[model samples]
Target chain A: EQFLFSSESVCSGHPDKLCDQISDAILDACLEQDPESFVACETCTKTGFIMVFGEITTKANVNYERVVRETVKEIGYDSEEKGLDYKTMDVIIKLEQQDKNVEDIGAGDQGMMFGYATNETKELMPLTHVLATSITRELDYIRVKGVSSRVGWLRPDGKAQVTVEYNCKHGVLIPKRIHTILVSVQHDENIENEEIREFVLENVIKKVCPSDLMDKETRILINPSGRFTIGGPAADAGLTGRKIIVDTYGGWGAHGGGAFSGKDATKVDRSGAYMARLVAKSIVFSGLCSRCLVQVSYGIGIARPLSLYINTFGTAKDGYNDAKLLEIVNKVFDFRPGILIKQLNLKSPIFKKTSSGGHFGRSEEEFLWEKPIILQ
Target chain B: EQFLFSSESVCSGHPDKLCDQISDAILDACLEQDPESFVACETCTKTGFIMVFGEITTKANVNYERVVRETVKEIGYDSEEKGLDYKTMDVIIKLEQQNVEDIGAGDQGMMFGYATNETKELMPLTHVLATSITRELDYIRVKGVSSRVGWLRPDGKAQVTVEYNCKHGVLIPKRIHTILVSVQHDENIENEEIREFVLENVIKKVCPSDLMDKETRILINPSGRFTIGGPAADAGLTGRKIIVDTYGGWGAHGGGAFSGKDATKVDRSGAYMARLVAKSIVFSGLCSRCLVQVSYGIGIARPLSLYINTFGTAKDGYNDAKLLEIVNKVFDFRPGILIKQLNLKSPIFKKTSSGGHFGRSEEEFLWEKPIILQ
Candidate 1:
């Protein structure tokens, strides 16, 4: 494991987040009505229509139209006068309802998902992505918190990136300093450039993000395109599972390419991944290793997994006490797709919250990976 | 990665794969008429209407409708069906065509492609099952002789598993057994009969997937309700099967999703990195295990990060050996060269619509990856 690993996340306001929310919202409603609802939904949004289509077999009578409308308004899209507003936004619900797979507990496809962690930052992530997610989260938080008074109109769709220097200093993976920090946030039509930058610096970048990670020498690109008034799914056709990178490591770990928000537990792309994270976090937290990854693969209709693998790099190889690592992972977890869903209380509309931004958090409250493992 | 990992792919007759092929065919046509076409299309196929939407910014004067129609007819959907049939089904192209990001990264998401040398199966044995099933379905399909689907439909899936014993006396690690197979029908066949038939006809006939183990768990639409399967049941999107597109879970993923992307998107270019690295590590005789990962930010010409996960303890030492820098230098990874090296700027994406994106035939034009990077 060399070179810094980076992963990022987005807030619920990003365009792709909107589509994820819509799809998952529909799924949550279906699940709420019937806990055994079979939904493998995919959503795409652009311009005027919020297109919802997927294969589902649900016993719920929840209103699909209301779900679409409510998801939009909650996302702060109240006006039809500007940029594909939710009020006049068209809703197309294409249903392929079927009573399929109501009895099986395994995933729908044969896929693998990787979960990883490192002791690099307090968040246990690469330095660059830590800053990137920080900046984007800060920008979105203040706007949602109503702290940026300078911007009259601000939309939810935006992104950020951080470039860090990784140099070989005597055989060590060193992230010396920040190279570039880019932030893009949708704002009012008549906002001035300097004003926007100033507000972002004061309310979002300097306050919400880690100020210690930044300096005057750090190159900052705020809306490099000058005006980002036109953004969100309207700017580009937004699909439900397209933001796999932002949701996980920024291309650091292997992905099964399954979007989380739109899918139910039978798909390993979402659940098995979360389990991998739980195992990875446990291994790292148990003091058995500083860096670790858990990889899992499952087959269709099979309750038992097809493959399970683990790589600790050299973390515990060099005369480290580690017999408890395997014991703890085995004793503390079930690894079943059904067991994972119940353990995380995963069936909820809350996945829309994870559609953007990384799913792993440094704190103990949110994601299973962010929580520390008490080792022997 | 201690547990089972599974990935599935569809056949040409699969409703979703059919829709993906149609969309990619449109993309290829757009590239043929205008290689500068930038499209982020979203298509859905069900019973009747073939709905295509999303934004496009291409400078081509081609007939998109004709292209869609021809692509559909060519994929064996030509009939007088109600909801859909290449001939009977009508195409509704939602025209929201406009200019978008002519110079920036084509899309703003991450897509990952991964590979490993743990198994000479090339990919992890678990994922090999997912691909093998697709290959099986493809065989049954190309022959056009069997009527697996009682309702004249071709939608199926496959999976397999293997155990690794590490070759007791040998030094290097290898899995002794690997399993994989898949099944699809011509149309609406019954469950009890299709299950038995798949085990006998589809599973038994396919090599590499056949097994004689009492512990093996053969499944049929494991969710237990695939009787009403395909595009008619579940909505399929292009580039949605990305995990299946790359190494199952053998390597790290950058999270870049493929599908609906041209050469411009890093997802496709990044995929070339997967193939290149897998081939390089295996061929170079690096560790018996290796996985390459490359990361890039928007508007950036070079990758943000590149990593090599070599779990083989046989390596000299961690930092003292400096194996990472060698990995970085091994591949070009630049935008311009990535496109050229993969020969990506052509109408060669349609074939990738099925069987995921990795472990393809040598004849597949765009199926590129690592191992040569060494």
Candidate 2:
């Protein structure tokens, strides 16, 4: 039987992504000054204001207001013409040192975090999530550059969704072809709908989407909402970690609902998920399975994961099982908070780049979690 | 192969759940006065203040300040001993009518709602058990407050992990292995008293005896001291407890949070509909393990896709496609129709804000009422 599965991705200028970027940028600044800064901040953005609130126990005397403005400007929201001016926006920072009452930063909270890997794409992520984000990547590329006829009227807020046909062969889901591609870019009011559709189809869609998968019947919907002039923080409210599914497998897997941005490596929500992905990616890249889901759970104040479950989704060879793989994973990987932060070099300030699009599948040099490993 | 699956739940007073409650309380108030109101309000709370900000277009002249205070009061932040009092807290509200150009939902998102027949409520047993633990603690703290209640506090959280034998032939999910409950308490009590009270009242009263065994490990307050609880100790944002609100980890989520948005935003309404569809399928005995995913583009009345999976547990006579056909014929999934059928415009979101949204048999959660299958 055949099936249809679609995943979506938004550009960095999207309101929710903007909030995530600012949250991570704050974390980066705090880490630069004090690597052990116990930061669990969250950022929310609307039309003209960005509120930064959460628990922060740091000795570093960094300017939070300046960090918010710099991150917003870096996200391409500097100009007054952009509608969300960084210079004039109000940033209220409400941070406190780790409360003396419950200062133990074990897990922060309890929940499950999942990491997935498949051999479908070079990044080892599912094809639909990969291609869906690629279109937005191109859109953001064109939106950030100087004046150009093809994409001059484009704004920062945009989204792309890709629906692919899957064939269940021998009890495994195999990618068949692209069924539909939906791309909507926020634009200036002057450009006609048809021209915007045609421009995105020729430049963005055709450039990233696989040519073989798109056939005569493949449907491409651009700017389905007609006029998207009012977008980003101007149109809706944005909160950190609201895009958890988009940040990970795009609903193809399970989530613990712990957000990544504004959290340091101590919070299992961010670092545990990264380590799980590194573990799963290494397993899949080692030819032990075609697809794997790594689940890690924890309790507060615990240095070790309460449970680490690995599922190969029946992709393992005849003699192997998930339990066997788990044993191997336990031997190779140590999910202790201190080890994860140190081994992955997670204290770096590169989180702004990891906040948008997708986190798991990227250049190994950029995200150490993307680096591959061999399983013995 | 056997697997150990875990899901978590927090009480109404938990920081994240508190933010969710305030957001939905405002929505309920707006809808009560003006049912046609459109709201996208968001709430975030730290130590001493709660800020409400978003785009709200409502004809009702509701007082935002009063609503915040009243809701917090109901959540039991009344006494100054709680460190956060509704009377003295600062409330900042920034709301406006719908933008002229983007009157529609210019934002794009997705959500997933799920139902399973592994429990009596048509929800997964793991989730039901997890929620039951949190609800029992809430009952012990407030319902039995007159008794020896020196330890209990308004804030708490619990997680339950179940190990099941999901075999194809037997079809019966047997045994429960591990149950983990982490709760917050007042510092005046001893660790032994808190542990003993929670186990006897919260643990023994809720979990079924038959499902338990001598080997089952029950952990109480894994991290010793839980004195500082509620918003004073942690920062909470609305829409953060999405997994706890939904099916825990039993089913998939489309990444949309249900709090702070009105019915027009399909993240809340569409997810409600998806659960309705899944519950009816399981109630009709068409499938034992059913999961449904539905997606919508911005400003579209009709959904872009509807997908269903039975986890290879479709009942004897029906196949997947035939079951899907019956589903398509039995239900109307248009966003407008969902608003009408579920009575989503009513002021019933307040009850849903507390505890888990699914698995409630109450009448106000109209989506939970299983429609008769033809």
Candidate 3:
């Protein structure tokens, strides 16, 4: 009945996040110029070379070179001496109009998407990921923005892995406490390892982790590799959507095989998952269950969903079976691509906010899907 | 409890699969020449252009442009008449040697692998159905028999959503609710002709008859016409089809992709090792169902943690903690040992790139070979 599960997260300045930020920036640029732009820009970068290639059918006439440079600058990667340089990087933009032969619009690809929520954490996400992301966000805020009490020597390339102990009781998984914490931070060469470890333990770990979840037995490791001086794109290449688990519930929930950064609303992979989270949060908010997972699948060129399912993991308040929960959910939500696009207001340029943090379980008001809906 | 779960698989000629193939081809080339080559190349494709960009440190200097061209031609994309043309398509290769200063892994990431005995291949049923349907369509088109039928094209996609009856005592999932196959055909081919060929060869020949009923609705090419497909119609990127490569959404994904990577990276080798551990445990008969999760760090060679999930209890009231102890004694999960134990440095990745990566009983895939229990 006992187990330990781990989930990891990265900071905004990480290589993969740099590419995700670029892709989402291009998506937002298309949306700003033309609301109906179809953008699926995929990005890959290594060292000083960056390439942005995908299909786009729009009148926006986007200057992708400028977007990549500007986005890199905004992500605190402009420091050429310490990390990646925004100005010297080579940018390649290869885009083509959407296939004109097809008669009408179709879902860009075929796949399934999943949404999940649990009462184990305040954010309605699994405890390990929430803590992992929170620690990374706090580290980035202190490093990139440099709060008054922050450590100035810290760098943008960093990672955090958290392990939580849980016990299964009565057919339900309940988190017990924090088991182990590992953090690797990119820091200035001038600082001593002992000082760096102490600073991170006080300012980053203690600031983000809940006191109730920690005790004398909790194990914490700082800068596990000792030194992370060389990091970001210079150390490894970065690609869009490579951190899919970090963007979601950290392997605790299922993924629909879709990446959220670049796609438009009509791509059910993006909007459908948002709708699933909205439905799941609504159900949990209504006190129908402590945790819920909603799944939806659609075929290419089809307007309606092929199936909608709900799994409470045998903790449903009533005798609510999958079919019964599905029936009630159908009335409360609409899975059609057209309806989902309008209901969720997905055409905005707000996707960049979701690039770094886990898309769900965020407290930001800009995330419209996080808004609880009436389950009745 | 009654539930309907769905998973999908695309053909080899599909845009995304094209990129996966090119990436893995590059991987095999590096391994074929220099076994220690550190490669994590990624490829993204559009209508007429393809870009290969990433880090690679190899003693074997690869002609990436030729690799991309040759790989595309091998996949039957040489025909410019119906689909993409390897000769005319623009190819860009932006690769750099791995950074020399980094003493640790050239790359660091997390990954997951899973195996189940719900089917004969030790894979989940939903995943098996989804993969089998796609594989049949590929064989029909590429086996020179397609020239006889003259109705098939190089690009197609198939999906199956099955309903399973959950019985309390038994440990299996039964299917047969809805089957959908959308296969792209030649522009000259009629809709009825395309439907009949798929139902006869793909559905009737591949799928078991007892699993269906009179109400089992089989829809083919629901859009009515799949005249335009492949890279010309959609953008493709390597690592995009990760779910299809692994468990097809039946088992959990650690979000680490396998294509375009060498045995040095934990993301690729670690996942393969986890699958070995899982298949070994399930084959040992310690439990009827097993899902294993293992995690690792960048510099650390050993796994950070190894976990086995069997629904809080297993058959015969065996202690899971003790089982983990025995597994540690049985398997070597270190990254170096993992590569050596699984023979991951081999150059057979091109085969895995085309078909499903897991649930392959073929002798070629050494990871599918179940190890002996201690």
Candidate 4:
């Protein structure tokens, strides 16, 4: 039956994303300085301050404080009070960097992680999730570099929702229409309500979207409740690992909820997820499934997984049974924590570029989407 | 044309859940003393110390230190520097309490709670089986009542892969095929060697035989390693257990991560979603499968959209069209007041500190299950 499936994402300045970016930034620094450094970091951002805490063990005598301050500053949080206000924002780091002795060659966090791909978008994320994030990506240009004059006292606090119309020509969800566009943007208090509405309606919404996608019948809610003088970590508060749904594949696929930030590649949350995405992209490319969800679970120090399960959702048509698909996955992929990093080129300091649209199945400036392993 | 599905969950003692228990404990105390408090707390624990930080506003006096300690005490983190103890554990709290006069909820996130009538458990078999194994392990530790399982530790996790044989028309998952459980235990004689002991003794005791087949490959610590496993060994973060806290992967999440926050947060509203879906399915006997995705854009009072996917079932002549109309009319989903509808006030959250947060009929575990009358 036709249904309304929606997904939402926060701007980089959102508290949760801020933590994610900071954590990823830490991972990038540690990895660059010492690739094999044992690291596990998690940060939380709230009103007027940031809290950093986690487990770590490494020989990379890196400047922990500079890594965090710079990540926040670059993400547009540089302010005397709120932005990259180093002196003003409360930044605390509680370090517990133990000796480098991991029981499993990686850190410990007991859970499974999921990745999904479909022949839907080139990226394989669901239509709603892609469009929702794309809207934010479209506006991010205006915020990151004063590219547009229409952007108001805008900080990095905004959300986008899209209702994608999926048509069934035979029995599949065909590309149909863009149903709805709902954007909640953060602006300065000095701006008038009318001006804020006009700026958003004309510039942000009208510029990114064509008139055909949204019509007079479509609902366009711009700051529905009105006042949003305070945004970002200043007004609402943000934390790491809170935006798990938007982080991976949205609700288009399932999630194990292992956060992606603040950990080295060995921490399955960061590396295992990359492998799952690589696996998903293979199946999507194989044309076996219009949709495929790859879920992997790892124990504390186990080099092998307790379980490597797949939910193809009956989208496979290679004429192979479930066993064949499983065989193909195991043979085609090496689901190890360390190997995943090298395979996906995950050590790049590129996470700050993520999450405007989300951190999954995205087209990078340059990165490995999937590699075709020679069938042995 | 069928597919294989798997779902896994972590036990309460898992690092992430520990963080959640600590965070929620603080929130429960603040709300208990003063209901009008606005709290946005984040917690991370590793080795011995627990760090708590977030944005909160309340007129009531909430003992932040006591809340952290007592909550850890309750979670059984009761060792000197290794396990979590209320009195001696090094705890740091960075709190910023002030006036928050924003127009909306203050964050853009999503949360989803779910229920299914496929089993008497009101959830899919994969998730139910995973939760059962963890629940059994928790039972052995908390009650000290499992006959043969006396050496259970606080930290562990379980997963189940149910292969459904849909030959029958009732939509029954044919059988529970495989149950995978990996639990962390303290060093008794040794940690590495207990892998075989857990499979033969622990796995056999926890699972139902009718479901388990000889074909099921039960591997303990399949990674061949299990020495270090707990908050003490690794850092734990709150809200990281969102998948395990609810339906694992069987249901959809609105992207609102729960734990350590009040119902006013979209994470809580995302949590209440299951009741609405469960009520709709049970009340109307709709489809065999149901997924509800509810999204909130920070400060907005009403959700941006209350999306309902009935999984192609049309009961009572109600499809997505009718369901949306009845849902908007029948249910009140305003962000602020939904807390009262779910009866989320009071300090009753400690009960949800363990076990899975979905598909329980216990009277005490009201929020985990939901009042699905009408």
DockQ for each model: 0.01, 0.01, 0.01, 0.01
* Residue B167 local lDDT, model 2: 67
**Tens digits of per-residue lDDT for model 4, B219-311:** 566665454667667788877777776777766665655676776665665466545555455545665556666666766866677777665
Q: For candidate 1, write residues A67-147 as lDDT tens digits.
A: 888888877776543346777888888878884323337666677878876565656665666667777766665555431
lDDT of each: 0.62, 0.79, 0.77, 0.66
Candidate 2 lDDT by residue in tens digits, B110-208: 556577777878887888888998987776566442224635667788888787777662134466677887777766778887788777666766787
Give per-candidate clash totals: 68, 1, 2, 19
Candidate 4 local lDDT, A76-123, one digit each (tens): 776633343655677788868873333335436566877787777766
What are the per-candidate TM-scores when only chain A is compared?
0.86, 0.93, 0.93, 0.86
List the candidate 3 regions with Cα displacement exceeding 4 Å. A97-110, A147-150, B1-374
What is candidate 1's lDDT per residue for B1-374, written digit by digit as tens?
22333444555666667667777777776676676677666677766667778777888776767877887666555553312466666678874789232233434434344444544445665666556656655554553322222343455655555554443211232222423333444345666766665555455444342333555567665555343445555566665655666665556566645556677767676676556665555545555555566666677666666665564522344331465666566656766666776667666677676666666532224333234432
For candidate 3, write residues B1-374 as lDDT tens digits.
77887778889988998899999999888877887787888999888878999989888878999999999887778766546889999999998876222233333445565666676577767778878888877776764323245466667777777777655422455656778887877778888878877776678656766677888778898878986778888889998988888887866886767889887767777777777777776666666567788766667666677788765325565568876887898887777777777777767677788668887753336577666564
**Candidate 2 chain B: worst-modelled 10 consecutive residues by lDDT:** B99-108
Kindly list the per-residue Cα lDDT of model 2 for residues A1-376, writing each as its tens digit: 7999999999898888898998988888887777768888899998899999999887678898998998887677765455588988999888776632222346655668788998887678998999898989888876774323335688888899999998876546678899999998888888898888877876678768877788999988887767888887878788998888789987776887778888987776788889889999999888898888899888776767789998887888666789899898998898877778777877666576788888878752337688777896
Q: Model 2: iRMSD?
A: 24.7
Kindly indicate the candidate among 1 and 3 with the higher lDDT.
3
Give candidate 1's chain B TM-score.
0.79
Model 3, position B353, has a per-residue lDDT of 83
For candidate 4, what is the recovered fraction of reference interface contacts?
0.00
Q: Top lDDT: which candidate number?
A: 2
